[PDB]
Design a protein around this ligand. Structure first.
Ligand SMILES: Nc1nc2c(ncn2[C@@H]2O[C@@H]3COP(=O)(O)O[C@H]4[C@@H](O)[C@H](n5cnc6c(=O)[nH]c(N)nc65)O[C@@H]4COP(=O)(O)O[C@H]3[C@H]2O)c(=O)[nH]1
Ligand SMILES: Nc1nc2c(ncn2[C@@H]2O[C@@H]3COP(=O)(O)O[C@H]4[C@@H](O)[C@H](n5cnc6c(=O)[nH]c(N)nc65)O[C@@H]4COP(=O)(O)O[C@H]3[C@H]2O)c(=O)[nH]1
Lengths: 224, 225
């Protein structure tokens, strides 16, 4: 792991992303919860939304002065795991429930992935048994990828073997050879279902060729 | 190119802590323009911003709950984008720290910001201006210009100044690429460094084309081979 200044570290974290708060009371009792990162006020405070927890834990584990270990994630490229200690300084209910946490001078950062994931937005179809539904590739690596599907579309579970046919252009006809792999992770949202995939040998060869046709436009990878 | 986008997706494009431009039109018709840092958003309820660093007068006068304003935000990656929308100052807090809560409309306008993409990188180098030579680091590059940073205590430049950047072609700094020459177009000092935007002259464009051709994209940004 590496130690870097808090301004630079937090700059790697997208606002609204999820933070993992591990709180340790004065007696030693631990408590972990998740909550959205709002942002920072100057160099004085780290702002987060009040955790979606019980009103009992909320006032027995979430009190001013209590310390906690916070984990944040930087999604781009090889990604990064960010860890640091912070003290709960202030709690407000109005105009909206939120917490002000202290910002240490430095934070620890560690590599999250073996290789980088490249962002993109490529429409395609996902194959699974008799199903063939719409999907969009959101990121691609040499070993895997991320794709999303409609909330009402067929769902997959970790371990399922699927294949993605990515359109080579807007015609919605011709596609790159199948990207085959197993679902490794998933996360349902209100606007779509997300899946992480790890390619089998054939998938890796086809991904390699697809990456070879993509160009970086300063923001993400794009097709011709 | 102009399009309408839902606020959640549009604000996801804006980096937290970045400067917002607020154009306020009081209920009289009086207009005021100030800038202030974007903090973030709470759920899909409020847009949080730090209090503008303006005089108390203009403050209690142009910055009051209920007042409306047109906000301009920036999406900095690549060709970037200009995000424009209308918002109402809903709440003003003083404790524990001064901050304002603005309303978030359902949709926002997204329009073109740049004529071409800017590619991020981190290349150490030297900045030359008149008889001075100082350390700098190239932060982004495009066919027509670049962005570079310098130490807080180093020699400063003003818009219009013609400078030259000698970027090292290797980690050890055993040599430099042909110079990136052009005029300063914008600047901004921050806690850890001074930042400048530059627009190349002919020579600059030629050498920038040469430099870009030697860089690879590692998924996060361009780097030396
Ligand atoms: N391009 C792409 N590839 C994917 C995706 N999901 C899975 N893979 C591929 O599958 C491998 C194992 O993923 P995992 O089981 O989730 O196991 C993961 C996961 O537990 C953790 N990890 C990596 N990135 C993240 C992240 O952004 N968030 C979290 N919470 N964990 C991560 O590290 C482990 C190894 O990650 P990798 O070295 O990248 O190795 C990854 C990657 O090659 C995806 O969305 N996009
Ligand atoms: N690579 C790079 N090139 C730079 C930089 N600063 C200036 N240039 C070059 O100089 C041209 C004019 O910059 P400008 O006078 O600030 O005039 C700018 C500016 O007024 C506005 N603009 C562009 N990007 C941003 C931004 O990130 N923030 C803000 N506030 N305005 C921007 O649009 C105008 C035209 O922008 P461009 O089409 O890109 O054309 C830019 C670009 O080719 C830089 O930091 N990096």
């Amino acid at each position: 792991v590496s130690t870097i200044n808090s301004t630079d570290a937090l700059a790697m974290v997208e606002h609204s992303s999820e933070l993992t708060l591990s709180i340790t009371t004065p007696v030693g009792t631990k408590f972990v919860c998740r909550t959205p990162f709002i942002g920072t006020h100057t160099d004085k405070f780290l702002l987060v939304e009040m955790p979606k927890i019980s009103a009992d834990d909320l006032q027995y584990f979430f009190q001013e002065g209590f310390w906690m270990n916070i984990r944040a994630i930087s999604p781009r490229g090889e990604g990064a795991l960010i860890h640091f200690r912070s003290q709960l300084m202030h709690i407000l209910q109005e105009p909206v429930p939120m917490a002000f946490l202290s910002i240490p001078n430095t934070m620890q950062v560690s590599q999250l992935r073996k290789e980088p994931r490249f962002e993109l937005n490529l429409a395609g179809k996902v194959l699974f048994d008799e199903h063939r539904g719409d999907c969009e590739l959101r990121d691609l690596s040499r070993s895997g990828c991320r794709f999303i599907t409609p909330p009402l579309g067929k769902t997959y579970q970790v371990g399922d073997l699927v294949a993605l046919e990515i359109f080579s252009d807007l015609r919605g006809t011709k596609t790159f050879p199948p990207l085959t792999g197993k679902i490794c992770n998933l996360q349902r949202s209100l606007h779509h279902a997300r899946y992480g995939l790890e390619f089998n040998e054939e998938g890796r060869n086809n991904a390699k060729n697809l990456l070879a046709q993509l160009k970086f436009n300063g923001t993400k990878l794009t097709l011709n």
